[PDB]
Design a protein around this ligand. Structure first.
Ligand SMILES: Nc1nc2c(ncn2[C@@H]2O[C@H](COP(=O)(O)OP(=O)(O)OP(=O)(O)O)[C@@H](O)[C@H]2O)c(=O)[nH]1
Ligand SMILES: [Mg+2]
Ligand SMILES: [Zn+2]
Ligand SMILES: [Zn+2]
Ligand SMILES: [Zn+2]
Lengths: 166, 86, 50, 98, 76, 49, 97, 55, 39, 99, 122
RNA sequence: UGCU
């Protein structure tokens, strides 16, 4: 979770003038940045606040009200060392499929650092004994439109001991 | 009259003449080795200025351990005009 | 014009802004005078002066 | 999950910068190479030849035969250019004084 | 504050057109029209009543700008 | 300034009418000029060979 | 088209354009000569300034800087003819603000 | 077929010099507008025969 | 220029397009910012 | 007849007509008479709003045949035009949404 | 649609919880049918993030407590990331600071752990 | 080729 500065030219139709301009801008920004991953920024959750809001222009075209609004929004973007607590939403032979609680099923922990008893035989077996912890390692983003996903990140689980659950 | 061609010519047409092989000799080998050594040693030279990294994520205690350290040459300000002093 | 077979053109704008601009700027009641010397062109004619 | 990409922007042209293209830029812009001098095929359908003039990969000019590059009709097709190489260079009459 | 206080015919036309477009796009009316099915007539009524929520942004050639309200300007 | 490649435009600029009433079609002058240019290039290549 | 037999429309000649300019009805002139006559939406790449198709620029082999733009079909034809003549018009787009 | 109701009653009916293929059940306009040439344009397309264009 | 404006299909700078219009919407410039507790 | 003078500076448009003129002093200086035949052909796109909803309903019910009416309707959700000469004009009028 | 700074300022989970609660109450107070039908992903993401933060121990927090914890940790020369992780996790056991928390070498001292536990529990 |  981190704040990100953005400047958006929001277009409000004429039938929304009876509503408050700031409230309409906030609703539009939320609808536009709800469940979407901005490249090199992360997945934006919602709008935090609006800092600067200059004059509202009206173009001779569509006739709507275009406003250039500067705002701050919250995005989920770890700092390469953040610790999280997720749940195992499945498991694959090459690696478990852990997912943060109802947030995003994109965490793919590689099983290449645990003690030397690591293997998945497709029976949803997590690990042979001697709320799942996760340590973010690196981020990565990719594009989608390439002809006429985008966030997976690397997860780590060192020898944390875990006296509560093996 | 000239015949019509259905497909376009090849992007890389073949040639019956091949390049002459390179000259062989201890001199050429030593020159190659010296050029490779220069390529390897000139990148680490202080004159090889790298792109200044920016937009650091956070500050950590391991910053002092991972801090890149390299001696910097001092230009001759007597010969160089004053418009290049930091 | 002289009403001796002249064919004139009639256009219908397809936008409210264009309609308003045509009615305001190109209004007959507002263009009763020419910008050349300000003399009124829309006035009485034959069969009315007499 | 989903990436953020803007759908449409109210882009306004600022100014037109005229210029010229080198042969490499012309090749990069063009899609195919026109080398056949004929227009239609020998069959009675008179279909346009491939890699030749009037090819449908460089746009469309008929309401029945759509474009081959983009799967759109004539009303929606913008057209595509082609590059034809010359054996010997030639002076550009427009730029001859230049 | 240095320009002419009178509202020119071009400004009149542009404001009326913009208001007519907004009304045709289901914008709220602030004059309580009485059987006026014409957006341009509604815009003219709003102009005569001095209730059009539009502010003219007059730009000078150098780059400066100045705001003038419809109710603040003078109409003919 | 010295051209070695000619940019043949799309077919939108070269409209072609399929005149089914006869064994021919109506083509613009640019198409004929490009055809003549290609024929001359082929003839020059043949003479060089 | 031109003729009435072929269902042709009227022509707003140069004199009509001059009259509209003198009147100053900018929106009227625009709706006449652009919207109601040869309105079309093209795709222009903000990197090279060339014309794309279906939101794709074949020159740069990318689609991130391609954006839609309203332009007269006659102006698009003129740009294409100039590009064929090797006079490449490089369009540098920008926000309307 | 009609994109709205799925009917196949598509009739080509020109409405005041406007060719339009419209459905006869719901009146949904399927396609409209046709690109023809114009006389000067016709004049300038030159006649070339298949004996030369085909090869 | 008016000629290139007409050619490109944009409102010419002369006439009604010399100035710009603004909407008199009920708003509040520089709204109150939410205070940051952690920073 | 070039692209600059023949297709850019002066070009042909639609929604326009050409007709012979005749005198009629019974009309105001700012008024002009238009024949029913040209009026039924030259149409104007009106947006359905909270003011002229009933007028547009009545025009659609009249249809393209009667002079006061319309010819086509473009929905707000889908841009597929609908010809009033076919279909139930009463239903089309009863299902007129804003926009 | 460009961004100016993706790492302007880090914030704990309490701020996100408060923002989500405010958005949820404003939504249930001024719900709009067409606005909700246009984009339903907003509702889903808000509800699920709120449910996750509720599952977490982030409850029973206040800005006064946050400021007190920050002022108490300022005297431990700990880094912003460490204090952020500690405030977001609220560790009740010692192992969570001994091993899970990074940069343990030379920072534990085997005496400051008791003070850290007391401060995070108070 | 006619029309204004
Ligand atoms: N009905 C009609 N006949 C024409 C027209 N134009 C040309 N003609 C015939 O052609 C002769 C003169 O036409 P020209 O002006 O020489 O034709 P042109 O010079 O090509 O005219 P442009 O096509 O405008 O260049 C007349 O004496 C007519 O015989 C026309 O526009 N309408
Ligand atoms: Mg006469
Ligand atoms: Zn194409
Ligand atoms: Zn490009
Ligand atoms: Zn149907």
């Amino acid at each position: 979770f981190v704040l990100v500065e953005m400047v958006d030219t929001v277009r409000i139709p004429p039938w929304q003038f009876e509503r408050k301009l700031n409230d309409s801008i906030a609703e539009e920004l939320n609808k536009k940045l709800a469940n979407k991953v901005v490249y090199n920024v992360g997945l934006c959750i919602c709008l935090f606040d609006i800092t600067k809001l200059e004059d509202a222009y009206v173009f001779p075209g569509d006739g709507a009200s275009h406003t250039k609004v500067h705002f701050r929004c919250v995005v989920f973007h770890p700092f390469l060392d953040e610790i999280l607590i997720g749940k195992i939403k499945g498991c694959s032979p090459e690696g478990v499929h852990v997912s943060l609680g109802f947030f995003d099923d994109i965490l793919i922990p590689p099983e290449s650092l645990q003690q030397p008893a690591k293997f998945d035989e497709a029976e949803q077996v997590w690990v042979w004994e001697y709320g799942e912890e996760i340590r973010f390692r690196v981020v990565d983003e990719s594009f989608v439109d390439t002809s006429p996903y985008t966030l997976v990140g690397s997860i780590s689980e060192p020898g944390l001991g875990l006296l509560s659950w093996w | 009259l000239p015949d019509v061609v259905l497909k376009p010519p090849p992007l890389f047409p073949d040639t019956d003449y091949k390049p002459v092989p390179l000259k062989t000799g201890e001199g050429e080998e030593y020159m190659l080795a010296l050029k490779q050594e220069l390529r390897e040693t000139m990148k680490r030279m202080p004159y090889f200025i790298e792109t200044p990294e920016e937009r650091q994520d956070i500050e950590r205690y391991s910053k002092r351990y991972m801090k890149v350290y390299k001696e910097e040459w001092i230009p001759d300000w007597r010969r160089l005009p004053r418009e290049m002093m930091p | 014009a002289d009403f001796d077979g002249d064919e004139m053109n009639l256009h219908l704008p397809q936008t409210e802004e264009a309609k308003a601009e045509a009615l305001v700027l190109m209004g007959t009641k507002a263009n009763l005078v020419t910008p050349r010397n300000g003399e009124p062109l829309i006035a009485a004619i034959q069969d009315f002066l007499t | 999950k989903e990436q953020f990409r803007e759908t449409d922007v109210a882009k306004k042209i600022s100014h037109i910068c005229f210029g010229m293209k080198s042969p490499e830029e012309m090749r990069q812009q063009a899609h195919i190479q026109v080398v056949s001098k004929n227009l239609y095929s020998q069959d009675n359908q008179h279909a346009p030849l491939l890699y030749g003039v009037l090819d449908h990969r460089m746009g469309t000019s008929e309401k029945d035969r759509p474009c081959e590059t983009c799967g759109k009709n004539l009303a929606d097709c913008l057209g595509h250019y082609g590059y034809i190489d010359l054996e010997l260079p030639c002076f550009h009459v427009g730029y001859f004084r230049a | 504050r240095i320009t002419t206080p009178y509202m020119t015919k071009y400004e009149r036309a542009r404001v009326l057109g913009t208001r007519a477009l907004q009304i045709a796009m289901c914008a709220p009316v602030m004059v309580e029209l009485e059987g006026e099915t014409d957006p341009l007539l509604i815009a003219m009524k709003e102009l005569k009543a001095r209730k059009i929520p539009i502010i003219i942004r007059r730009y000078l050639p150098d780059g400066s700008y100045e705001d003038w309200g419809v109710d603040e300007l003078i109409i003919t | 300034l010295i051209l070695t490649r000619l940019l043949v435009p799309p077919l939108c600029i070269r409209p072609s009418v399929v005149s089914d009433l006869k064994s021919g079609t109506n083509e613009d002058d640019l198409t004929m000029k490009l055809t003549e240019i290609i024929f001359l290039n082929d003839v020059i290549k043949k003479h060089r060979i | 088209t031109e003729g009435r037999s072929r269902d042709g429309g009227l022509r707003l000649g140069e004199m009509e354009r001059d009259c509209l300019i003198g009147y100053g009805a900018s929106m009227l002139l625009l709706e006449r000569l652009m919207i109601s006559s040869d309105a079309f939406e093209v795709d222009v790449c903000g990197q090279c300034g060339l014309l794309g198709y279906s939101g794709w620029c074949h020159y740069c082999k990318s689609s991130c800087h391609v954006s839609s733009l309203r332009i007269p079909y006659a102006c698009k034809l003129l740009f294409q003819e100039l590009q064929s003549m090797n006079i490449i018009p490089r369009l540098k787009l920008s926000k309307y603000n | 077929r009609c994109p709205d109701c799925g009917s196949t009653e598509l009739v080509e009916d020109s409405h005041y010099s406007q060719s339009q293929l419209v459905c006869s059940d719901c009146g949904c306009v399927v396609t409209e507008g046709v690109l023809t040439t114009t006389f000067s344009d016709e004049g300038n397309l030159r006649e070339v025969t298949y004996s030369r264009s085909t090869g | 220029g008016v000629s290139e404006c007409i050619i490109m299909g944009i409102p010419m700078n002369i006439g009604t397009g010399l100035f710009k219009l603004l909407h008199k919407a009920d708003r509040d410039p520089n709204p109150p910012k939410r205070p940051l507790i952690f920073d | 007849q070039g692209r600059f003078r023949g297709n850019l500076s002066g070009k042909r448009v639609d929604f326009s007509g050409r007709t012979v003129i005749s005198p009629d002093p019974n009309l105001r200086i700012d008024e002009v008479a238009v024949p029913v035949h040209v009026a039924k052909i030259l149409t104007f796109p009106e947006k359905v709003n909270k003011a002229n909803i009933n007028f547009l309903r009545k025009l659609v019910q009249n249809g393209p045949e009667v002079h006061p009416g319309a010819n086509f309707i473009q929905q707000r959700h889908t841009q597929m035009k609908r010809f009033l000469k076919y279909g139930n004009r009463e239903k089309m009028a009863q299902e007129l949404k804003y926009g | 649609m460009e961004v100016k700074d993706a790492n302007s300022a880090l914030l704990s989970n309490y701020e996100v919880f408060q923002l989500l609660t405010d958005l949820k109450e404003q939504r249930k107070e001024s719900g709009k049918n067409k606005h909700s039908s246009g984009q339903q992903n907003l509702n889903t993401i808000t509800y699920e993030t709120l449910k996750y933060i509720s599952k977490t121990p982030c409850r029973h927090q206040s800005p006064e407590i946050v400021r007190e914890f920050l002022t108490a940790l300022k005297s431990h020369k700990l880094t912003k990331a460490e204090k952020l992780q500690l405030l977001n996790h609220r560790p009740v056991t010692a192992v969570e600071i001994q091993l899970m928390v990074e940069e343990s070498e030379e920072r534990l001292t085997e005496e400051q752990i008791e003070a850290l536990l007391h401060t995070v529990t108070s």
